[PDB]
Amino acid sequence: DAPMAVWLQSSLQRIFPQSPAQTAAALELQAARNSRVSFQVAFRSNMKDQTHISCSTEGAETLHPRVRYVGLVPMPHFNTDVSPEELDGVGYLPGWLPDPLYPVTKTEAHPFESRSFWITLQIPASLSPGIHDFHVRMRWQEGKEEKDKLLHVKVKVSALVLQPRSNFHVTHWWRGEAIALQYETKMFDEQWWKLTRACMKNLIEHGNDVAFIQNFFELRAVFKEPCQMLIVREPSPGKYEFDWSRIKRFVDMCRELGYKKFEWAHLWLYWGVQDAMHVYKKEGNAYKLLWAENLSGTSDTYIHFLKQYLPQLHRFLLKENLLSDSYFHLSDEPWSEHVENYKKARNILRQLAPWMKVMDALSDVRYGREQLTDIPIPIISSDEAYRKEQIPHWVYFCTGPRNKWLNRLYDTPLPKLRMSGWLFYKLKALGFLHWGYNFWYTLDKEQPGDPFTEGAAYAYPGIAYGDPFVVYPGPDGPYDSIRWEVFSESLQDYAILQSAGIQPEDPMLAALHTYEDFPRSEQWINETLKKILEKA
Amino acid sequence: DAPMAVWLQSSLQRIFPQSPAQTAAALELQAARNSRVSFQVAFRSNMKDQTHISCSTEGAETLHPRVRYVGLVPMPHFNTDVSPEELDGVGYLPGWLPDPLYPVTKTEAHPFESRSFWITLQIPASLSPGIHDFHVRMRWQEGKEEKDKLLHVKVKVSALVLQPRSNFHVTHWWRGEAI
Amino acid sequence: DAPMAVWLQSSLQRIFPQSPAQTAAALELQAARNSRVSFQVAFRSNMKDQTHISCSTEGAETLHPRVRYVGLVPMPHFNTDVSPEELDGVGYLPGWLPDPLYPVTKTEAHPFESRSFWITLQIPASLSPGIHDFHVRMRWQEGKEEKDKLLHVKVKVSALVLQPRSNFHVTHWWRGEAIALQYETKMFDEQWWKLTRACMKNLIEHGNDVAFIQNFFELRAVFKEPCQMLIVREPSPGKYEFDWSRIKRFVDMCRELGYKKFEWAHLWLYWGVQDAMHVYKKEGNAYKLLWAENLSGTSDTYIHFLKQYLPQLHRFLLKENLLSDSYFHLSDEPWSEHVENYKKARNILRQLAPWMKVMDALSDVRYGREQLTDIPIPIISSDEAYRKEQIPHWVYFCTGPRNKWLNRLYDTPLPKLRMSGWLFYKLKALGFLHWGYNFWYTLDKEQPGDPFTEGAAYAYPGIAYGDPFVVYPGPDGPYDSIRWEVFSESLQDYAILQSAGIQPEDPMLAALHTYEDFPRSEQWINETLKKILEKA
Amino acid sequence: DAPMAVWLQSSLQRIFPQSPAQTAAALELQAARNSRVSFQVAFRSNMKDQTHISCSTEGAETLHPRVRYVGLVPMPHFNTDVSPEELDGVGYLPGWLPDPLYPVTKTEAHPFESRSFWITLQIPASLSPGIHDFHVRMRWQEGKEEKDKLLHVKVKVSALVLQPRSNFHVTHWWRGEAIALQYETKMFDEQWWKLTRACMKNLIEHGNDVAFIQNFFELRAVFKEPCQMLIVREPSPGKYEFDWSRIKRFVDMCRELGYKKFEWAHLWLYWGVQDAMHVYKKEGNAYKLLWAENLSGTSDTYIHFLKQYLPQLHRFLLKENLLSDSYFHLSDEPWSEHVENYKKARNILRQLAPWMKVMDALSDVRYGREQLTDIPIPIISSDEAYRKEQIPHWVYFCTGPRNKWLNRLYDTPLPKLRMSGWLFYKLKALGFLHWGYNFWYTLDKEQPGDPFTEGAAYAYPGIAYGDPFVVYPGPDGPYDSIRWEVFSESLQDYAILQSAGIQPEDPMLAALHTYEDFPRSEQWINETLKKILEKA
Ligand code: NA
Ligand code: NA
Ligand code: NA
């Protein structure tokens, strides 16, 4: 019955506004050295009158603590095709959903509403192993009396020191046009470049080690201001020249941030493999297409442009030392019938750019086995087939699959999401790709949206709430979300397995059978980490 | 564990999206003659896949029924200076709140979400006193199979006939600038 | 804010009167076939006025449900030497404690007071595997309106069928004088015999498979009406005759109830190993000692009696086919100094009864390594030492040890207690012994007590609340307690591990390190059973 | 996280065992001179092991401090018909309740259990106004280290000196049979007279200025040893003689203790007004009725006895100078239908005792307006009606009314109870009556009880916990309770209002509207007293 409740809680449990108060005061955490670890400080006012509340740490200076506030976004409906066993928030949703993380340490406490701060700890490589403790102080007012409570946090620091992940690469298709739309700035202006640096820095600090370049704008939809980072001009009919200066700046920036791998945009448009890319040239204030919207992939015009572009790309790659460090795309998901479309396109590349190896989403194993692509990217629900053929591959996931399958949605429970990197490791994926880092705007339209009130690009239920974006637009760059912090900590768990020498075949991982059939409790994660980290 | 729940409920109880399904089938109302009276037809899908649902009356023509859909608005916080004893929605708010009434009789039923239609009855002065009953029909799909349920409403109509209110005046400061 | 709250809850969480209402409606359980499983139906009136409430099942006929009401007893203080981390009821105790189970399905609901019914399910061996569901109905009154609520229970019934436990034996020193004192009847009259059958049947249905015979009364204190089941008469000085008829009736009874193993009383009195047992002979209305209270264990008198008694015992055991099915005791816990006492007594037994093998509480490993006894019974806090010596042994526990250690007290959390059989199994105990099944009276005095208001035999804090008794005296036999149902279900979990073929060395049990260092959450129990039972 | 917490707390806040530790060190009180004031010294061990703790004062000699220990009694349920807004102990009860005050200053501190001592200060008339301070010392052990803490108490002493209360009379129906039953002594033996003097002295030291004489035993139930202080013997049929010696001793005693006012037993039995009193005459070892249990109030036999008794009563009253200082009773609460019963009885008295004026519980205002009684005693919930008639009257309360209404129950908040004298004063009661000072035994039966474990005379919920008794049986007289000290301090506040000259109409009291609608916070009491006392 206390006027104000405050408790500690782990990073794998959502707190909904109408959650009941808990009592805690004490939390123990575990961490490898050179790693990052998270927890929540929850609070619920039992007072008619609103008040202020402040979160702070004491004695945590060596862990460079970071204190943020968990904001809520509206979730209108549960995502479809998800059984209740696989939904988070049963009893609480549809309703307010915790997700964005805001950089404040003081907020207003509202009557009878459970909220939380999110605290991020940096465990340095040099820290002495064993137990390190600190305190969290919560301060508020009851009338004119000042009140406070201390809570006790313990981190049991393993001897294990994490090494950089190897032979596993992660890419997200971040969107320059989303920055242009949500912040209302000219594409490639200097504000655009700050926001882009800030995003790429966010990505690499959350485990994404591949920097996407959209040299060609990716959408079928035609934009007035597309994000085409390659500059193209057409002085006389069918003779093109190319200015690489924007891509060159992006590569400089990403290399300064720590990237070594880069990824290039698609070369044929995703209606099957049947259309050519939309490529624009500047004119007046905005951009205009070089050829017809419906131009075919096998056209004379588009192949005449590839005859000139691909060698220029090769010269750029040489000049900037990017051949061995680039991943290339052709086109996405040809069904069986589309196969010959893509075969023709692939042979065209082999003729014009034999140096270029391709990777693409091919979920049909019978047609990724045929060698259509060079490195296939099945959706996770086709992973098993590729594994029985033992074909090496990347995996991706998007609005689907759902129900029992791994995913990253608003209503995917956090422990399930936290299994991502364990599954990546045990099922021996080469890498993971995802389309929806900051796709903040209206699906397939040059029309900004509102990520703080709309989580499915206005396309629910085909687009699941949570699929388009894991970060939110902040005034100077991205705000993280809970999902993104958990996903990042999951890529870290993949580094824990690797650094500790655990083999995918190890019995402690044997219940991870598919991207569908796998343990998904916070306890399995805690117990398995305790074994690994205390063996050391 | 039924795939679709539908029940009846009175006009004095908010139904929140995460409310549990109930069982009803039958509701009795009371009404003076020359008056207006209301109730709700609630529904909760227990299916992963969304489906359509339709609300209609049968045998109610003399009550000129009106069928509307209850919409939700976001309630970010409880209002301050209201103790919990005096709050509606304890355990469900802050959250989605039922309040607007929309003029539709069909909607999409969403997974695991309790919603309702709102039904308005006109009890005419000329009606015979006593029990008048009618049925409500709900129609939806499970896969390609059509499904329905009838529910039973009874109105116990008094001999009292309402007269126009007198010596009591009500005003609201409607706002032309708001339009 | 509902006038009446009713919810479902598991058998591993005490409900205190001032617990907050919950919402539930749905509970899932898991169960092996040929087993028994439990849960609670909780309820809290939010009304000024008291009302009646009734609990019943619907659609459970195949599970022979049993519906009982959880009663409360006073807990005046927490037991000492228990850190708050290890106490149940923090924030609620000292106070009313749920424990006795009464056979009613209707009670009065009192204002703002959270109570619960306790429901028991029988999962028959023949039941079909998979999900079985039923409902619980609660009925009460609000003013003159009848009200009710259905709640939904689902039991996921494993393919596994439990086999009788083997090679693990459990004994409790039930007390006949406790029946005579609490029901005010003559020792060995016919009501005494009904109540003894009821107690022994209770025991075997709770996993206790060894029947204790107090042929000699165990207490140092001299009683006027001792529970000495052997009839002894001394017609001339130092010549004794023996009547086994009461023991023979007890053995018939226990065999009819299912027992095969039996246990005999101590032969030397528990002040070290230095005094002879108090043995009585009838005289007038009650009994009188045969020799002085302080007679020594190595007396001429006592050895002259052992020379006559032990061959009569051997003849009886032969006649009744009980030698190989009997456990025998010498005396308990000699400190180092006392060791020669016990050595001398042991040699006397070797001389007079070489057939008799002995088992006793020896918690000193260096003097159980020396062979003093034949089967040692360390207290659990000495188990580790005995295991590094790898000496086979039983374990016991009593008022101690406490804090982190396994125990069965009023303020021992139920998931901790529920771990008993997991610990017995993984740490490979031969058996478990406990002194306090129904020690209902005043410690070491011929004076009844009141188990419904006194839980430590009037000896706290040396005797812990919950230590003397796990059942309460009912009009026709024992009433069960929550502790007793949980401990029973824990012995059943030992049968689950055995029947499913889980080896003590199995990785799923590797965190069970000692009777002190071991998981104790409801989550661990549930998840580990889910693995075992769904592998099937 | 201190091993032992100690803090100060006011006399208007119950401390429950599971209350959290607080920090204090400093408490200021306010007091009129010639008054008595109280506070608590609380303590909570945060230690696994029990320890001793001792409470004492330093520098308080001029205030004649008294240090006692608050004991707990079991409260099984809340009283019914009390909304939570009006219950003390929300979140802590049902459970252990503080109430008895025991004469010890050292106790055992138990693990994680908040307890308190109760300290009583005497503020002498002669003290200099202004601030007086002293210290409280708490001493305990941690292992073998002795530990202690000083706490600081301040008392702000007003210029106001309290005068003896006037025109306001308080009576409690103390029970001689309760002493006989709970101490197992013969009625009117010499132990009886010690315990009776001790009770009567207790009452007058708590504001009770009227001594009840049960000349006739009050209960309908027939006792073998009734408390009938008038000695009656019947030598021949229908001719009675009277020995007044016990009543005379009782009057001498109460006059020695300070009483001036007395009150006599009922003359008609409380089944309506229809039965005659049970009057007994000695025989052998105990007493026997003079006439039938069911004899009528209007019988010939009983009126023939009143013809003889009432003139003897008058002669005694003259001889002992008691007419102008005595209150008389007829019978309690006739409903409307019973009215003619009581009318007949009243006229009988007018014929046989016209000098006798009567006061009785009549809650029906239309039948106290009719003159049935001379000075009426409505229950508090009928007070309002009697005030709108502006009829002068006494007020009483018992198991009822409840909810918002004033009362003195185990679960009545102490600030609410503390308003009693403020309400008596402002609503201008002539006096207050209560049935349950020391009704310690089983309701309506010659069978002792246990006030330490049963607080409703075994009759809950019809009898509310707390209603039968405000003191507990001590070895040499009553133990006070918290409720009794608070009630006493409330009668003292009535003396403050009187001695300070505050008028019932004074605006500072205007929120006191009814015995239901009235402020009930500690803050209101404190602020209003501060105003009164600092005007001075
Ligand atoms: Na692709
Ligand atoms: Na032994
Ligand atoms: Na009276």
Q: Do C84 and D17 touch (CB under 8 A)?
A: no
Query: What are C3's two structure tokens?
Result: 């006038």
Residues of C in contact with B91 (CB under 8 A): 23
A92 with B18: Cβ contact below 8 A: yes
Q: Which of B84, B85, B91 sits opposite C23 (nearest CB)?
A: B91
Nearest Cα to Cα of residue D368 among D346, D400, D398:
D346
Q: Using CB atoms within 10 A of its CB, is residue C294 exposed (0-12), middle (13-18) or buried (19+)?
A: exposed
Helix, strand and coil percent figures for chain A, each rounded to 5: 25, 30, 45
Residue-wise DSSP of chain B: --SEEEEEEETTS---TTPPP---SEEEEEEEESEEEEEEEEEEE--SS-EEEEEEEES-GGG--EEEEEEEEEE-SPPSS--GGG-S-TTT-SEEEEEEEES-SEEEEPBT-EEEEEEEEEE-TTSPSEEEEEEEEEEEEETTEEEEEEEEEEEEEEEEEPPPP-S--------TTT-
Which listed ligand is nearest to C342 at the C-alpha?
2
- In degrees, to the nearest 5, what angle opens at C-alpha C230 toward C-alphas C226 and C236? 95
CA distance D310 to A348: 131
- Name the residue among C31, C23, C47, C12 with its Cα closest to residue C414: C12
Closest CA to C457 of C447, C469, C443, C446: C443
DSSP for residue C351: H
- The C-alpha angle with vertex C78 and arms to C77 and C84, in degrees rounded to 5, equals 145
Distance of CA C358 to the CA centre of its chain: 22
| CA C389 to each of CA A435, C366, C385: distance values in angstroms, whole numbers, following the listed order | 61, 10, 7
For A333, the token pair is: 């998901």
Q: Which residues of B touch C1 (CB under 8 A)?
A: 84-85, 90
Cβ-Cβ contacts under 8 Å for C478 (sequence gap 6 or more): C198, C199, C202, C438, C471, C472
**ω into residue D461 within 30 of 0, thus cis?**
yes
* Cα–Cα distance, C449 to C457 (Å, whole number): 7
Cα separation, C486 vs C101, whole angstroms? 12
Rounded distance between C-alpha atoms, residue D164 and residue D160, angstroms: 13
Q: Please, is C284 exposed, middle or buried when counting C-beta atoms within 10 Å of its C-beta (0-12, 13-18, 19+)?
A: exposed
H-helix or E-strand spanning residue D102? strand D95-102
Tokens of C372: 């003093």
Cis peptide upstream of residue A519 (ω within 30 degrees of 0): no
Neighbours of D84 (CB within 10 A): 13
Please tell me which chains touch A, using 3 or more CB pairs under 8 Å as the contact test. Answer: B, C
A433 vs D159: CA distance, rounded Å:
84
Instruction: Determine the 3-state secondary structure of D512 from DSSP.
Output: coil
The arrangement of strands across the sheet holding C51-58 comes to: C26-33, C145-161, C130-142, C51-58, C106-109
Cα D111 from Cα D51, distance rounded (Å): 9
| Residues A372, A332: Cα–Cα separation, whole Å | 12
Exposure class string for A228-258: b at 16+ Cβ within 10 A, else e: bbbbbeeeeeeebebebebbeebbebbeeee
| C424 membership: H or E segment, kind and range | helix C420-426
- Cα distance between residue A43 and residue A4, in whole Å: 7
- Rounded to 10°, the helix D176-183/D190-205 angle is 120
Instruction: Tell me if residue A497 falls in helix, strand or coil.
Output: helix
Cα–Cα distance, D200 to D29 (Å, whole number): 29
Q: Which ligand number lies closest to the CA of residue C266?
A: 2
Helices D190-205 and D245-257 cross at an angle (nearest 10°) of 40
A171 touches A327 (CB < 8 A): yes
Interface test with B, best of C1, C145, C149 (most B CBs within 10 A): C1
Would the CB atoms of A521 and C521 count as touching at under 8 Å? no
Residue recorded with tokens 């907050």: C20
Find the CB nearest D80 among C49, C403, C461.
C49
From CA B89, how far away is CA A109, in angstroms rounded? 19
Total Cβ atoms within 10 A of residue C137: 15
Length of chain C as a residue count? 536
* Residue C355 falls in which region: left (phi positive, over 0), alpha (psi -120 to 50) or beta: alpha
Contact C23 B85 (CB under 8 A): no
**Beta bridge partner(s), residue A506:** none
* DSSP state string for A294-341: T-BTT-HHHHHHHHHHHHHHHHHHHHHT-STTEE----S---TTTHHH
Distance from C-alpha of B112 to C-alpha of A85, rounded to nearest angstrom: 12
Q: 3-class SS at A248?
A: helix
Give B-chain residues touching A50 at CB under 8 angstroms: 80
Chains that touch D (3 or more CB pairs under 8 A): C
Cα torsion D490, D491, D493, D495 to 10°: value is 180
CB C117 within 8 Å of CB C104: no
CA distances from D401 to A159, C502, D81, D86, D338 (A): 69, 65, 9, 13, 22
Nearest to A96 among B82, B84, B95 (CB): B95
> Which 3-state string (H, E, C) describes D344-372?
HHHHHHHHHCCCCCCEECCCCHHHCCCCC
- Chain center to CA of A410: 13
Shortest alpha-carbon distance between residue C164 and chain D (Å): 41
Q: How far is Cα B150 from Cα B6, in angstroms, rounded to an integer? A: 9
Instruction: With residue C385 as reference, give the H or E element that holds it.
Output: helix C380-388
Q: Using CB atoms, which residue from C91, C507, C511 is nearest to A508?
A: C507
User: Cα distance from D98 to chain C (closest Cα, Å)?
Assistant: 12
Ligand 2 mean position, distance from CA A511 (Å): 46
Cα–Cα distances in Å, from A275 out to A309, B152, C335, C340?
A: 17, 58, 92, 98
User: Could you tell me where the DSSP H helices lie in D146-276?
Assistant: 176-183, 190-205, 245-257
Instruction: Report d(CA D31, CA D62) in Å as an integer.
Output: 14
B72 CB neighbours in chain A (<8 A) are 76
Contact across the interface for C524 and A524, Cβ inside 8 Å = no
CA dist C381 and C515 (Å) reads: 7
Nearest to D499 by CA among D258, D206, D128, D164: D164
Tokens 């903040």 label which residue?
Answer: A440
Q: How far is CA C37 from the centre of its chain?
A: 18
What are the percentages of helix, strand and coil residues in chain C, rounded to 5?
25, 30, 45
Who's near C347: CB < 8 A, 6+ residues apart? none
Q: Which residues pair with C15 in a beta bridge?
A: none
Q: Does A501 touch chain B (CB under 8 A)?
A: no
The shortest CB-CB distance from C25 to any of B20, B84, B85 is to B20
User: How far is CA A186 from its chain centroid?
Assistant: 25
Cβ contact, residue pair B1, C25, below 8 Å: no
Cα B76 to Cα B97: distance, rounded to the nearest angstrom? 10
Query: Cα–Cα distance between D432 and D408 in angstroms, integer?
Result: 13
Q: Is residue D296 classed exposed, middle or buried when 0-12, 13-18 and 19+ CB atoms within 10 A define those classes?
A: middle
**And the tokens for C335?**
């400190």
Whether B1 sits inside 8 A of C133 (CB atoms) is: yes
The closest alpha carbon to C160, from C415, C496, C525, C526, belongs to: C496
Record: contact A112-B81, CB cut-off 8 A: no
